């Protein structure tokens, strides 16, 4: 199927050392029997489970066609290259876990069209540029760890950010803001 | 004198006009007086004249080269799997003794040179793998003694021209793999009365499959597929007399399949899988000696006529997606050496066929969302050429036989949504394959057995909503390689032990709804991919670990057990409102 | 080199 199609574009670019992704044959009618896979009843892929695969490689933005997705678990792997904006479609998602990884670039400003994400753990990555002000219009916002990037500029302290500890923005290039050490011009 | 030549003179010039990294070329000594025991080079006859030059695979890099065609008695060149790049040159008419040509595999772009029409003896063009583009030059209709046209995997963008109809010579058409301006089948292809291939598959071929197609008596394979064909298949095929192969799979075809399928004495594959057709799979096309039958993602409905069973050829069968009724043939797999049977989403009813794979070569067993009933055959206790069992979503009933529990290739066991019932037999130790076990929703009872930590490579335990009972056996924490554990609404008793530290790769642990006893493992912090934790409705006691704060848990139920003591401080948020409700001293 | 997928039968499956 479509989901199917995405993923299997997916494991052709990420490289694979330990075959972790052996089972996600795209001769299947859907991935609901791919390990590392979760279905919903309908069949449709609400979890991808792949923390700590010894993952290299880049996402693709075909990972936003999955609709339904509610967990995506990259973490602890050595992905390379962009967060990719398409991530935003991700309308039902609940946790974006993309953290121990090389992620490089900006945190797409489509993140914030995820009005149900109550998990974003960004943490250990290489990303720069400054923290999304759409991220505060995410209501169901309780856990955020954006720490050991290269981030900088305002840390926004309003809406679902208004309850965040210093401990989510720590050892970052140039924050600033009531959160940091440092004020803001 | 008369017959006297400089063919190793002109190969040197070939050598010249090509890179060759790796050598293949080194044998090709300009000091040599003849070149016919120079690699790739053959002379048939008297006069040392080279009649065959085969390049293959050489690594070559260059433009063709037409001095090659100053070689006067050349019938046979391949340059096959090389880098020979730009146009194909106009000049290459010069060859005029070529009977066999093989160019691809290559670099060559731009549009075909019409020239190649010139070339009287030609019997042979292969540009499989070309970057070729443009329309297909009108003097292709004009070929004299051409055979096989093979035009496959280019950039050709025009209309399928009718013209290729008018080469009576020819016996294989390939224009496969060419994103074509989209184009009817021309029915002037009726008038090549000695082809054997039609292979036009991904050619954006629209409009319907002409009647005149049944004319060709001699076509072996007629192969249509991947394209946006429309109407009926015609009853016309019925008079292709010699036809093995029919692929009409992935069209906007509607009808009935035509019962004059049955006429064809030699058709052993057909694939009209992924249309829209309608009505009932005709007995006469059954009762043909078939290998393969697709037939899936259709609009079919009706019974699987029982004729099927009687071809002693049969490996596949794949007519999942239907509203198919009635019971499968009572002898499938008896007479056949059956490896692939799909029936899956259809409304298939009645007991199993006992004997699907009484030729031992039945590899995958597909049949859910029907509603087949009875009990497993026991024949399939000792099919171990099973690697995908999926019996999901049917009324089946009993004991699953001991020996289907311990076959030695199968990945995939489900049988879920069935009324399943006994225990897993010790049997299951014998799964040295099993990847993953998803028995849930069945009456199974009993113990998981000891034999089931055995498994090394299992990555999903799914045996939710049965009776299973006892302790888990201390051999489950053994498995890490498991990545899913879902025990819910089960009968489980006793404690969780420092032995689930073993579980390094466990994302899921959902032991809900047990009755499970004793102190929740300080070991659970030691799960470094655990993101998802129920083990809500059961008497779990005492202080909850301090180490299930350092999880990253995305999901967390420990409501309804006896948890005693002060909530860890990370876990004290209004986020795990609902994760620990239920506990009374907490 | 394109690898050329074959005249015949699809694979689709369960
Ligand atoms: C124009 O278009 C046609 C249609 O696609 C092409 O035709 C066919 O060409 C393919 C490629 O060679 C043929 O495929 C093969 O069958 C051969 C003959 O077969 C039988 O005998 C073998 C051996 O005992 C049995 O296994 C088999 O079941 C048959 O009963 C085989 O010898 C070939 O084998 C090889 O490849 C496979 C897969 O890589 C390997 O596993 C094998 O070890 C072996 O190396 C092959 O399977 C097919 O038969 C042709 N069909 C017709 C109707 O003619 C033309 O080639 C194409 N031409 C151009 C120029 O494009
Ligand atoms: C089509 O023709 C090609 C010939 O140009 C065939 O390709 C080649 O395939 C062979 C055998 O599989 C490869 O050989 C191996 O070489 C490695 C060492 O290699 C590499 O180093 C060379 C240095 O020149 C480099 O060109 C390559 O890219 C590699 O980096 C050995 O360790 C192995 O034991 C083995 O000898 C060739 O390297 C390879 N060459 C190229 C250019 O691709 C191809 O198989 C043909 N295809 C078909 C379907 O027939
Ligand atoms: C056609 O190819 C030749 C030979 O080059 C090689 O094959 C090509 C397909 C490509 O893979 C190149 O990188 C390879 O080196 C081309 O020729 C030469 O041009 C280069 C500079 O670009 C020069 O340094 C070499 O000495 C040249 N060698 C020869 C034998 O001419 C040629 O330009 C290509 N033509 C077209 C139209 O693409
Ligand atoms: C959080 O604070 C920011 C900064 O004041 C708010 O900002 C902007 O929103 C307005 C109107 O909604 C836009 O026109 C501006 O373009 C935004 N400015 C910046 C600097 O981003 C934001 O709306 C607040 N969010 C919530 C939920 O209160
Ligand atoms: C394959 O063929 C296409 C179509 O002719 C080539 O496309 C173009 O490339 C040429 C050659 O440099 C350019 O001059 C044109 O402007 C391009 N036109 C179009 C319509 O894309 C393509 O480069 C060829 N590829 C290879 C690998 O040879
Ligand atoms: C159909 O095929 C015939 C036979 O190959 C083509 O024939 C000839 O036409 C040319 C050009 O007019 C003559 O010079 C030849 O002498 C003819 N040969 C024969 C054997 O008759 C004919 O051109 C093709 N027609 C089309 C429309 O492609
Ligand atoms: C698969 O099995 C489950 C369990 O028997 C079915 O689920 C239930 O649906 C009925 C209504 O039809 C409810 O009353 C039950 O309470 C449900 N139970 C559970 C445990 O979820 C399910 O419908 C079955 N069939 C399919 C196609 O999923
Ligand atoms: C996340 O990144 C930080 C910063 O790169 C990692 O940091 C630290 O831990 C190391 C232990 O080997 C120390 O040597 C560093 O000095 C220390 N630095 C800071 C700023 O804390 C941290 O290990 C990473 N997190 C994980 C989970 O690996
Ligand atoms: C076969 O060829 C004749 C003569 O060239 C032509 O009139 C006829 O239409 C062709 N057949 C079909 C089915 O078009
Ligand atoms: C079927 O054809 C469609 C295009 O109409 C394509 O998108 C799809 O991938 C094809 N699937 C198979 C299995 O051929
Ligand atoms: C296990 O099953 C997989 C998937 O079908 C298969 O490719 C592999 O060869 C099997 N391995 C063994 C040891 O049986
Ligand atoms: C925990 O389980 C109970 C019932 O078993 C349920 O009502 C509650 O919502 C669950 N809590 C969470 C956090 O999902």
Partial sequence: ?????????????????????QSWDPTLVNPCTWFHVTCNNENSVIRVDLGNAELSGHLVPELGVLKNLQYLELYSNNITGPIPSNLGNLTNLVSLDLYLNSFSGPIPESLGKLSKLRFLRLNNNSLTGSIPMSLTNITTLQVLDLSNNRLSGSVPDNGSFSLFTPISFANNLDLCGPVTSHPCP | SSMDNQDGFILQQVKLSLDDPDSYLSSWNSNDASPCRWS????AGDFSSVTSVDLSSANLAGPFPSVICRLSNLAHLSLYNNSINSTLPLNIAACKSLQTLDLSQNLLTGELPQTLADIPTLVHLDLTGNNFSGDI??????????????????????????????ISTLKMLNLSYNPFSPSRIPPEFGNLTNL????????????????????????????????????????????????????????????????????????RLLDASMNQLTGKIP?????????????????????????????????????????????????????????????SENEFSGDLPADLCAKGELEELLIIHNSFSGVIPESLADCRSLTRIRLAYNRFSGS?????????????????????????????????????????????????????????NL?????????????????????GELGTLDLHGNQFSGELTSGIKSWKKLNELNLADNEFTGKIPDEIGSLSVLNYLDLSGNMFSGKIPVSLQSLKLNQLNLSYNRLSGDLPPSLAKDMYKNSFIGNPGL | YVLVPPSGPSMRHN
């Avoid at chain 2, 049997?427 to 199974?444: C, D, H, V």
Wanted: proline share 7%; glycine share 10%.
């Fill in chain 2, 40 to 43: 790739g080079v053959s002379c």
């Fill in chain 2, 459 to 479: 990555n999903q335990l799914s045996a939710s909503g049965n009776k299973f009972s006892g302790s888990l056996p201390d051999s489950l924490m053994s498995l």
């Fill in chain 2, 137 to 166: 030059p009108a003097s292709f209709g004009k070929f004299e003694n051409l055979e096989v046209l093979s035009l496959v995997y280019n950039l050709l963008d025009g209309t399928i021209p009718p013209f290729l109809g008018n």
């Fill in chain 2, 283 to 343: 007995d006469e096309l059954c009762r043909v000696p078939l290998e393969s039958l697709n037939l899936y993602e259709n609009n079919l409905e009706g019974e699987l006529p029982a004729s099927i069973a009687l071809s002693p050829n049969l490996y596949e069968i794949r007519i999942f997606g239907n509203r198919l009724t009635g019971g499968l043939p009572k002898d499938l797999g008896l007479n056949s050496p059956l490896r692939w049977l799909d029936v």
């Fill in chain 2, 400 to 456: 699953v036989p001991t020996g289907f529990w311990g076959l030695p290739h199968v990945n995939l066991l489900e049988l879920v949504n069935n009324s399943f019932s006994g225990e897993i037999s010790k049997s299951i130790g014998g799964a040295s394959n099993l990847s993953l076990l998803i028995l849930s929703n069945n009456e199974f009872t009993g113990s998981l057995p000891e034999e089931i930590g055995s498994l090394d």
């Fill in chain 2, 196 to 267: 054997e291939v039609m292979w036009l598959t991904e050619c954006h071929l629209v409009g319907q499959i002409p009647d005149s197609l049944g004319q060709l008596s001699k076509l072996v394979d007629l192969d249509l597929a991947l394209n946006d064909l429309v109407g009926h298949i015609p009853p016309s095929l019925g008079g292709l007399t010699n036809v093995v192969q029919i692929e009409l799979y992935n069209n906007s075809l509607t009808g009935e399949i035509p019962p004059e399928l049955g006429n064809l004495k030699s058709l």
């Fill in chain 1, 1 to 21: 199927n479509l989901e199917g199609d995405a993923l299997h574009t997916l494991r052709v670019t990420l490289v694979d050392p330990n075959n972790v992704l």
